[PDB]
Each structure stands twice: as C-alpha cells, then as structure tokens.
Subunit: 256 residues, 3 copies
C-alpha cells in the first residue's frame, strides 16, 4: 500500500497551504515513482502542477498506482494539527477510501492519528504542451512576492517585461501607475540573492494579479522563484521544493 514517511512535515504543510486557496479539491496521483498533482483552478485560467519525487521521502513504498481525490481544504485543516517539526507518515491502504495521516513527534511522547475521508474525483490529466520560453528570470522569492503584493495595490493587471538589462513589472489603475524594474545582479554575494535573466528575445505580457498573489503563497517553500515565459504562452512560476521536487504554476495571459 501507499506508505510514505516525510521527516519534516513542514514541507507537506507548506505545499497544502500553497495549493489550498488556488484549487479546492485535487486528485493526488500516487505512483511508484513519486507523487503528482496536476489540476487547474475553478476558473480554468491557471494550472498548478506539483511533483514530489520518491527519493525525498525516508521510506516511500507504493506497489499499486493510486488516485486519491482529497479535498485540499480539509487536508490542510488536518495538516494544521501537525506540529512544525513532526515526522508525517501518509498511509493509504490498497483500497480503503481513507488516508491515514500520522503525525509523530520529534522523538517524544505524542503521536497523532487522523483518518481523512477521501472523495471520488473524476481524474483528468490535460496535456501540458512542452515549449521553449524566450525569457527566464530567476529571482529571490521574497522580491517577487513583494512585487506582486505591492503592484496589487495599484492595478489588477501586471505587465511583465523582459529586456536584457532587467525585467520590469508595470501596473496602472485609478490612483496612477507604477513600475518596478529589477536589474540582473553582477556580483552575486549569495546565489539566492541574485537575479539572473536568461533572455533570448525581449518579451512583454500582461497577467492578472489575483493569480500571481495565489502563486506567491508558496514562498516559504523555496527562496528562489523562476519566472519563465515567452510570447503567447502561459507564464510559469516555479518553486523548487528542496531535493524532493517542485511546484509549478501556469498562468494564461490577459486579453487586451
């Protein structure tokens, strides 16, 4: 059966808090090679895709494929009961329609057991057309969160622009317009703190800001975020979950 031991359940909790408000319910596709979760929000504008490889877990055992359509809100409500440093064991019996979340303690006298009731979800795996992006900005996740949360105060549409000497996020609204421009750092004191712009052609796109703000709730997962995009192709916000996988949000451009 599905028996996975995660040493630090903070990763799982942060993942659930990153997916909680974008998508209500998702189909965790468990396999012998890892865990996947590909689903698009209720408005069909953005598509979140999570992958957690097997080697990131301590003892990941899966003999048969599973599709556990968990309710993400309830799953996060259960995950909240776990501690910050707890070892989390996910156990899905061969076929039981319940997922056992076992929150052990950091080698202490507390063990918590929860049996989250699954629900049957009509699995659908839409094809993600592999594509080559013209601009790849790599920036500290704090800066992107700040930029989106700031320009959200002005307008609801961010115009992202990739030149060669720096990327600029513009926005406009009733109270004026404002544009934040970042230049690529040359003396990277910390490889985290750098802003690296792999540019192959200057691009300019427009995106909604509700969805970028929904994306930036995954900032505790990784320090660096990768904004990869090209013309007439949904932007790709990528957060690398350290040595165990990634969390990748796709967002379709805005009309006009």
């Amino acid at each position: 059966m599905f028996e996975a031991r995660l040493v630090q359940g903070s990763i799982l909790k942060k993942v659930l808090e990153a997916l909680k408000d974008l998508i209500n319910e998702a189909c965790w596709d468990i396999s012998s090679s890892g865990v996947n979760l590909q689903s698009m929000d209720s408005s069909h504008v953005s598509l979140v895709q999570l992958t957690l490889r097997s080697e990131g877990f301590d003892t990941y055992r899966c003999d048969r494929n599973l599709a556990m359509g968990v309710n993400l809100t309830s799953m996060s409500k259960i995950l909240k009961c776990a501690g910050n440093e707890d070892i989390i064991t996910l156990r899905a019996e061969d076929n039981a329609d319940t997922l056992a979340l076992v929150f052990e303690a950091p080698n202490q006298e507390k063990v918590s057991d929860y049996e989250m009731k699954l629900m049957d979800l009509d699995v659908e795996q839409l094809g993600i057309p592999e594509q080559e992006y013209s601009c790849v900005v790599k920036m500290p996740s704090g800066e992107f969160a700040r930029i989106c949360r700031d320009l959200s105060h002005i307008g609801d549409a961010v115009v992202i622009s990739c030149a060669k000497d720096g990327v600029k996020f513009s926005a406009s609204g009733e109270l004026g317009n404002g544009n934040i421009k970042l230049s690529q750092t040359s003396n990277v004191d910390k490889e985290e703190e750098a802003v690296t712009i792999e540019m192959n052609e200057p691009v300019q796109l427009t995106f909604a800001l509700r969805y970028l703000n929904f994306f930036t709730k995954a900032t505790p997962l990784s320090s660096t975020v990768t904004l990869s995009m090209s013309a007439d192709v949904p932007l790709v916000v990528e957060y690398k979950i350290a040595d165990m996988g990634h969390l990748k949000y796709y967002l379709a451009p805005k009309i006009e």
Copy 2:
C-alpha cells in the same frame, strides 16, 4: 472595608481573561480567608470556581464577609487599562456599589484610579461535592490547549480515555476522525513531564466548545490537572501562582 493590595497585578487580568466569556456576571464572595467565585456558565452547563487566598495578595483587609456583585465584562474592560507590571489595589468600600480599583505604576508616578459600578446580584451558589477522582492527569497546559484546539477542527465532541500508561483524546466528524495519544513522560525532562494516576480505566465524551472555553486560562499555570471519575463532571484545575486555584467542572454528555 475590603482593601486588597496585590503586587503581581497582572495575575488578576489573566483571571478575568478566562471568565469574561463564560461568566457574564459573578458574585465575588469576599472574606478574611480571601476571595471566592462560584457560578455556572451563561447557559447553566458547566461550573467554574475560583479561590484566591488572602495570603496571596500583598496586603489584605476585610472587615466583614461581603458579596460584591460584579459584571465580569466591564471589570475585564477596566483591567485592560492596567499595565503589565502594575500594582492593583481593590479598595472596596463597606457597602457602596462602586468598586474602587487603583493601578499604581512602580515609581512611574502614573497613579490611576477606576470606580466600577457594581451589581446588586445576590444569587446563591450550590455546594460543590468533593470526591476522590481516580483519573489524575497532570499535563502541560500548552499541550492540552493544543490538543483541544486541534480536535476542534475535526468534530464537536471529544472522547477522552485513560490507561495505566497514557491518555487518548479522540474525535470524529465529516472530515474524518482524529486520535492523539499521549503517554506519561518516562523520566524524560519535572517541568513539562506528563503524569497519570489511574486505579481503573475511564472514558467519557465532552463538548469541545467548553473545553476550548476552559483552555483560555492557559497563561495562568503552565501545568493543568485533569480528573475524571466515570459518571462525575470532569474537573480541570489550573493552579495560580501560590495564590489559589481555578477549576472548571464539565458535565460529560450522554
């Protein structure tokens, strides 16, 4: 006249921060032994009783056994106006219906006064039967509040069970079921060590709403004591800092 000077006045604040949501209006029974407060909740379900000994306050004087009727909401509102390191003096009069509590600041020359209107409430208090509970469970109040708040996200009723080497909280609801087992610390770190005294097994079901109401007294004492005798209103007891104790009695549901 009742005149009571208390050095660590913040204590009083926390006390009313644990009752203002259970008990709208109470009757402080004041005597030379100290302060007492006994009541049912606002819906006559669970009981609360508070004892503060006269040896706890810095100075105490009570020339006659009086029944000060106080609206706990307004008194908590007033006590919010008292700094943390303040000196509260509840200079009540002999019979006037204006309790007079002064917030002295230490060497800050911020003498503050407050004259709170009393209530002419004379409601009688039922005698609290005292029995030898056989489910003694001393556990850190932080962890107990954690457990209650956690199980509150699953269901409305908690099933508490005790065994010679542990205590199991359980709950159920449409989101699933949850079980927190907690075993007695086997001589593993006297300060936060959980301890269980059981002569027989016991298992009950309590409404989590009132358990969450009780947990608000967590800042009072770091360690809470639980007691449950099969058909006996469970008691949770927080020991105030060598001044008295606060106790909630919760009737198990059937």
Copy 3:
C-alpha cells in the same frame, strides 16, 4: 520643477500613516523653504499642520511655489509600496497633474517609480497665531498613547485638568469612571521619559477621545509629545520630527455649559 530626495525614507511613510485616517485629502504647499500642510478635518473639529523644512531633505529643489492637492489615502497606498530603507524622491513638474515618487532600494538594483495622480483642492490657509499657552506638558509619546487608548475604554470624552502639581486626565462612562493623574518627573538620567509640566493658570478642558486616538497615530514619529493648552483655545498636540520639522494637531474643546 520640485524635486526632493529624502534618504530617511521611513519618515514620509510614518507621516502619511499619521494623517491618512484623520485627513482624507490635503494640499501640500511646497516652497523653497520646505513643505507645509495645513488641513482641517472634514467635521471642522480638528486641524493638522505638518512642516518639513528644506534643510531636512537630503536634496531639495523648488523653483515656483507649488500647491498640490493629494488624496492622502492614495498617497498612503502608494507609500506602502516602499521598504523602510528606501530613499524616497518626490518630483513634480511646473504645474503637472501627477507626482512621481521614486523609491530606491539602498543596496540593490530595485528602483520603483510610482506616479500618483493629484486632485483639485481649493483650500484657504487658516490663520493660526503664535500663542503663549497656559499649560505645557511635555511627556513621552508612548505614555500619552497609552493614556488615551485606556480612557477610550471608559468613556468618549476626556477632561484634562492641568493643575499646579500635575496633569490629570479623566473620563466617565456607563461602566464607571476613571482618572489618570500624572505627576511631574524628577531630574533622573533618561531625558525622554521626564514629564515636564509648565503651567501658569490651572486650566480644565473637555476633548473628544476619537480625535485624540487619531492624534496618537503619530507616536513612531518622536518619543516626546507636547500638549499645549489654554482656556477656550484648541489643544495643541505637537510631535517633533527627527530634526526636519514638526506635526501639530489642534483639537477643539467640547461645548461647555
């Protein structure tokens, strides 16, 4: 063109979160001497006067005396986009319709240039004369903020009595009564917390607590607040700025019978 670069950026932030709830839209009078702002509350009960001298700005350049109306809520919403370490550069053309605020991060390549939209304000400068107040109480700001926030729980009117021995705030509400007497402090080491009551005649006034709580929103500006007060003239709550100017709040007394 008016261009003013200020390295201590946080000041602006704080000032705007000091006014944005008392005043809704104001008229910044920029001149070669500095920036002034006289603005009356919408209910004609409270007035605010801000002054930022040009010698406090790291770089100041004003050619013609501007008078730009701004929507202090929009300006606060724009300034909330600046970190507490940014260098803030205000810039406006001869008679432009917009005000460009450039927040430059101190040690990064992040430069954010917003462009606020001014409004049309036709305000008249009230003439406030230099007075010699009867009672001047210089106390720590946090102290006054605590006093007002505490008395707001009791009742919605504070009676300030400035006697000889010390000031005394009082309030009475449906749940009781309270009064904080505040005695003058001694010549003890720290200077900021030394209460200093200089009085000439014992005065007693009655003020609204809503506006006093609006005043205390400027406590992060400075550590010492100065309450000037005389008979039948508005209370003057003054907060200095860090050697740049000041921010005074005039509150008018209640109606006495």
